[PDB]
Amino acid sequence: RIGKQPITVPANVAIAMEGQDLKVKGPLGELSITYPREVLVEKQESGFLRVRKAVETRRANQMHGLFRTLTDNMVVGVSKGFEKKLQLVGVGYRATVEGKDLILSLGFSHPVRMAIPDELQVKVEENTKVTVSGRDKSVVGQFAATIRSWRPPEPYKGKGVRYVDEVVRRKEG
RNA sequence: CGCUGGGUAGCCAAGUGCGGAGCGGAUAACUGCUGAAAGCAUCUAAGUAGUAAGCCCACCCCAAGAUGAGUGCUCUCCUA
Numbered sequence: 001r002i003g004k005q006p007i008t009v010p011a012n013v014a015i016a017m018e019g020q021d022l023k024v025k026g027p028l029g030e031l032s033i034t035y036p037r038e039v040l041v042e043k044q045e046s047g048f049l050r051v052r053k054a055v056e057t058r059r060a061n062q063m064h065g066l067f068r069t070l071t072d073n074m075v076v077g078v079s080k081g082f083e084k085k086l087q088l089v090g091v092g093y094r095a096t097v098e099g100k101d102l103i104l105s106l107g108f109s110h111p112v113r114m115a116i117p118d119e120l121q122v123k124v125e126e127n128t129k130v131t132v133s134g135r136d137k138s139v140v141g142q143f144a145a146t147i148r149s150w151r152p153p154e155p156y157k158g159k160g161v162r163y164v165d166e167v168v169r170r171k172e173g
Numbered sequence: 174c175g176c177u178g179g180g181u182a183g184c185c186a187a188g189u190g191c192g193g194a195g196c197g198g199a200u201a202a203c204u205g206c207u208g209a210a211a212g213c214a215u216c217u218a219a220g221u222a223g224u225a226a227g228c229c230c231a232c233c234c235c236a237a238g239a240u241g242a243g244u245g246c247u248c249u250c251c252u253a
Contacts, residue, residue: 073208
């Protein structure tokens with residue numbers, strides 16, 4: 001299952017294990033997550049962490065696999081980083097950068113002046129598609145959903161803000 | 174007011190001014206972000222984001238008999 005899998009820690013990724021807390025030190029940030037009340041972690045003198053249950057119960061079997069893949073997202077998050085590939089479908093849906101902010105002409109009256117945070121490096125390499133880059137997957141997903149929460153792709157319109165190779169329902173009439 | 178014609182100050186509107194503000198807080202329906210119990214998944218079981226004329230606060234007034242009777246400033250207790 002999920003919970004029995006060694007944490008693949010790559011090179012130049014320092015593991016810091018503290019009292020009820022994980023402090024990872026990757027080259028692209030230091031993510032910090034408090035341990036659950038029923039999960040105690042063990043290490044075998046290398047780049048392989050193993051979270052372990054502390055009590056025979058159901059909730060430790062919830063946060064065992066949950067906390068397992070969350071620490072996987074910690075180590076892979078601070079080592080390589082996660083990127084989302086949004087795409088503005090259609091004509092006039094242009095997206096560009098204002099230094100600290102990001103502006104989205106989406107067919108409204110005024111283009112949306114949505115502020116990117118400091119932890120995410122976004123890039124517009126072509127005027128439609130926007131690569132939201134970041135360390136942690138949850139912030140990339142929340143801000144990518146926040147940009148997505150203005151114009152979802154309508155089926156008859158066939159034209160909105162969708163991310164790459166995700167199947168979208170379309171209709172003929 | 175004998176019946177009429179006008180009218181100051183009052184009162185009144187039909188007249189004249191003003192109000193109904195909030196990237197303030199938490200939510201209901203819903204859309205989600207990572208995401209496990211069934212190595213696939215799923216808005217949730219951990220955490221968390223947008224958001225209702227609805228709830229609360231802010232808004233105007235009364236208001237410590239709020240007996241839980243508040244707080245602050247100031248005055249006065251003399252003669253045998």
